[PDB]
């Protein structure tokens, strides 16, 4: 608002959102975390990753849970283990859920995550 350096123009930031590079799309991938995680980590929202576990609270499957299996920042979508949808041809695929429609409940650690959690701390 008061910062005239950056713009509030509809097209100017719609272009930014739709052509953002993968690094900025990763930050856009952020989603709210549950109450227990909020108390535990003192934060409010983290980006998601492939070995993460999440609860969706919006859409046709607003009650299901499950760990995510794969994400891709081109379509701005994430996929959890047990939201498989049958296709016309006769095979199972994954429904895309926008990260804004889900809340996390668990997170994992690795040689990268052991430092991302220290960063967030």
């Amino acid at each position: 608002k008061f910062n005239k350096q950056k713009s509030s123009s509809r097209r100017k930031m719609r272009k930014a959102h739709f052509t953002a590079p993968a690094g900025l799309r990763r930050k856009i991938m952020s989603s709210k975390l549950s109450k227990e995680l909020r108390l535990k980590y003192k934060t409010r929202s983290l980006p998601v990753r492939k070995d993460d576990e999440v609860l969706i609270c919006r859409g046709h499957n607003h009650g299901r849970e499950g760990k995510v299996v794969k994400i891709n920042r081109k379509r701005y979508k994430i996929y959890v283990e047990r939201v498989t949808r049958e296709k016309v041809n006769g095979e199972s695929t994954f429904i895309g859920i926008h990260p804004s429609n889900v809340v996390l409940t668990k997170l994992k650690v690795d040689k990268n995550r052991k430092k991302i959690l220290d960063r967030k701390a």
Binding site: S8, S9, R10, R11
Partner: protein, 154 residues
């Protein structure tokens, strides 16, 4: 304003007597749909408007300073009569006096929660309600020109 050379940036060929076609200029050449088409003009496709908009239009106006202070005084006086402010659109049926004045402690504290609380306690709960639910997307073409919402004044 429109670009200065809008529509008129091509060749002026108007071979139009004996060709059994209108005397309007046509673009020259061949191999394209553009060749032979009606060139720049008031009525032609891609021919530029008849009076292109110019940046030297009288955008602003000179208002006499005396005019302006007269108008400011008149509006201040009009703000001090209950009927005029009621008719303008403010719901003030619950406030006591129309030239409303508050003590200088209004400036002291800086939480908008307590600001709206002071407003409702003074008796403008319905007014702030009108303000909060007057927010909605505006009609027409303006909402994609960074002019989305339309808000009632309070």
């Amino acid at each position: 304003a429109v670009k200065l050379g809008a529509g008129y940036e091509t060749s002026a060929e108007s071979w139009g007597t004996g060709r059994a076609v209108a005397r309007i200029p046509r673009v020259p050449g061949g191999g394209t749909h553009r060749a032979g088409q009606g060139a720049f003009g008031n009525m032609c496709r891609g021919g530029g408007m008849f009076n292109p908009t110019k940046i030297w239009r009288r955008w602003g106006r000179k208002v006499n300073l005396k005019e302006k202070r007269y108008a400011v005084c008149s509006s201040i006086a009009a703000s001090g009569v209950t009927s005029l402010v009621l008719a303008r659109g403010h719901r003030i049926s619950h406030l006591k006096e129309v030239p409303l004045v508050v003590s200088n402690d209004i400036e002291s504290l800086s939480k908008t929660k307590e600001a709206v609380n002071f407003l409702v306690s003074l008796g403008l709960k319905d007014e702030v309600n009108r303000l909060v639910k007057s927010k909605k997307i505006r009609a027409g073409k303006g909402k994609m020109r960074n002019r989305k919402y339309k808000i009632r004044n309070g």
